[PDB]
Amino acid sequence: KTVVVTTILESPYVMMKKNHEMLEGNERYEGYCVDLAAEIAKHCGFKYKLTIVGDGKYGARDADTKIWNGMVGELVYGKADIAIAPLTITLVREEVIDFSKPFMSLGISIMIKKGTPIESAEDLSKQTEIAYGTLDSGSTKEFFRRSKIAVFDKMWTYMRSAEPSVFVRTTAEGVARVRKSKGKYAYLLESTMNEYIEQRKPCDTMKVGGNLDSKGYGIATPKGSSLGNAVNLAVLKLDEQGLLDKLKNKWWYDKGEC
Numbered sequence: 641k642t643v644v645v646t647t648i649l650e651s652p653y654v655m656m657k658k659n660h661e662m663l664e665g666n667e668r669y670e671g672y673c674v675d676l677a678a679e680i681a682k683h684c685g686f687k688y689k690l691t692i693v694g695d696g697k698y699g700a701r702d703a704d705t706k707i708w709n710g711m712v713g714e715l716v717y718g719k720a721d722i723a724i725a726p727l728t729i730t731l732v733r734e735e736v737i738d739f740s741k742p743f744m745s746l747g748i749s750i751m752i753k754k755g756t757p758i759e760s761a762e763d764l765s766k767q768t769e770i771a772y773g774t775l776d777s778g779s780t781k782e783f784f785r786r787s788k789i790a791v792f793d794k795m796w797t798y799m800r801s802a803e804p805s806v807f808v809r810t811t812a813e814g815v816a817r818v819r820k821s822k823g824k825y826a827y828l829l830e831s832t833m834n835e836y837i838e839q840r841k842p843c844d845t846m847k848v849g850g851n852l853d854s855k856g857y858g859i860a861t862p863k864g865s866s867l868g869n870a871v872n873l874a875v876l877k878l879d880e881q882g883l884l885d886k887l888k889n890k891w892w893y894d895k896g897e898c
């Protein structure tokens with residue numbers, strides 16, 4: 641009957657419509673992932689309910705209890721049937737849930753306040769005037785923590801014990817710190833979010849340098865789910881038709897402010 645979809649609020653993937661208080665159910669939300677969910681549902685022929693993950697996390701396994709949290713945990717423990725969000729495809733997550741082909745490509749990137757004399761990862765790792773950090777949890781932080789590359793190992797060694805903490809807890813926090821640090825803070829985040837903010841007033845940030853890696857976001861389903869196959873074929877079809885690009889351009893540029 642009704643497929644239970646777990647997601648999370650993160651602009652411009654899933655946001656509350658300005659008039660949401662007057663709306664109900666699925667109609668309350670808007671965004672790239674909201675449009676994507678509708679497309680996938682239409683293609684696979686299923687009815688569904690969008691729900692916001694309880695703990696507001698993406699997916700990580702606690703080191704003490706070995707229990708998965710976030711949307712990944714909702715799928716592993718049978719709370720939701722599918723997760724449609726900017727959920728990064730990682731080896732650790734791939735071990736416990738299934739991912740469709742990526743619906744969007746991305747790579748860890750650098751966000752600076754316009755005017756900052758930083759152009760790449762090497763630049764940051766060499767100086768100390770301009771501080772830099774990542775989210776206090778998530779795929780990006782983990783990338784630096786386990787990296788074997790000298791430059792990235794150098795950046796992690798710094799970020800690891802920098803004071804005050806160069807880590808932020810949300811994308812908005814990371815952005816504000818950049819906008820408010822007078823060019824003394826660089827925020828390491830996923831290129832997709834970076835490109836998005838760049839099109840947001842007061843248009844004072846920008847992405848610099850190439851991406852530190854290459855990955856993608858995928859629609860996740862619990863392992864053995866008889867939904868996984870259909871969802872993957874739907875993603876492939878929407879991508880072949882150019883709809884995913886059109887969708888990205890819609891929420892990133894057509895609705896841009898800069």
Ligand SMILES: C=C(C)[C@H]1CN[C@H](C(=O)O)[C@H]1CC(=O)O
Pocket residue numbers: 650698726727728775777778779780781811828829830
């Ligand atoms: C917005 C958050 C916390 C997410 C989105 N994708 C990543 C993930 O799925 O881990 C996290 C970003 C990052 O790690 O920089």
